[PDB]
């Protein structure tokens, strides 16, 4: 079954219009090689070409408007995660539900990063009301936070643990590999950020009753 032009597109199911062999009529249809199907995938917008988490985490590495450097660092992080052995999940630190098995993370470094950030990200934030808990003390009350605020707090914890670690080697991969190693320690449950996540969750459970405190509902109603 030797293929030839007169039967290539017919037997291969490829569109001759897409290849320009038999273009359309521009004077009638307006196009020459077919119209892209709408709506377009989000990744085709030049301002949203990168993943939401990757693009968000990259600009957190940026300093002094050096986005090109932070973009190469994120490329080194995803390259390190792609060459590291599959992680060993810890039952004590259950990752976000619905995540893929550990065997799939290495070849999918973007999900490796996403699963890590979305797993240690807290679910609540502690806001304080000035002078409503007693003798000048504040009334701390938990509140939920959107995704961008959850990922931002998580990845900033990771960078805080990274900057405090000592130097290991030389070259252009120092900071990149040092961050990637912390991303792996998070998925394996042996990282230090898990303590900061549980520490803020305790404050939420220890103050879940302040949502209806008498002070928060008697500001100026005791004339």
């Amino acid at each position: 079954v030797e293929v030839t032009p007169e039967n290539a597109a017919a037997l291969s199911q490829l569109s001759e219009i897409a290849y320009g062999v038999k273009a359309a009529d521009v004077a009638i249809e307006g196009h020459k090689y077919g119209l892209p199907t709408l709506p377009l995938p989000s990744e085709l917008h030049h301002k949203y070409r990168y993943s939401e988490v990757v693009n968000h985490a990259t600009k957190l590495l940026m300093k002094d408007g050096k986005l090109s450097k932070a973009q190469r660092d994120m490329a080194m992080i995803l390259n390190y995660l792609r060459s590291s052995p599959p992680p060993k999940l810890n039952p004590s630190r259950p990752l976000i539900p619905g995540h893929p098995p550990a065997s799939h993370l290495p070849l999918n470094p973007v999900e490796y990063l996403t699963v890590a950030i979305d797993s240690v990200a807290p679910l609540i934030k502690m806001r304080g009301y000035k002078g409503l808990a007693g003798g000048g003390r504040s009334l701390e009350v938990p509140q939920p936070i959107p995704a961008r605020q959850r990922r931002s707090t998580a990845f900033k914890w990771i960078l805080d643990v990274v900057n405090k670690k000592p130097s290991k080697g030389s070259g252009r991969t120092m900071f990149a590999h040092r961050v990637a190693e912390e991303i792996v320690a998070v998925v394996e449950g042996r990282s230090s950020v898990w303590d900061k996540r549980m520490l803020i969750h305790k404050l939420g459970t220890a103050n879940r009753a302040n949502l209806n405190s008498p002070a928060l509902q008697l500001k100026g109603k005791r004339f």
Binding site: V3, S12, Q13, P86, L107
Partner: peptide, 25 residues
């Protein structure tokens, strides 16, 4: 020629099948 011979490489499907074929332990 490749589509007929089934040689057209697609990195997306290559990784998917490898992960679903239980070959990644």
């Amino acid at each position: 020629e490749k589509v007929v011979q089934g040689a057209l490489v697609d990195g997306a499907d290559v990784v998917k099948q490898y992960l679903e074929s239980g070959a990644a332990e």
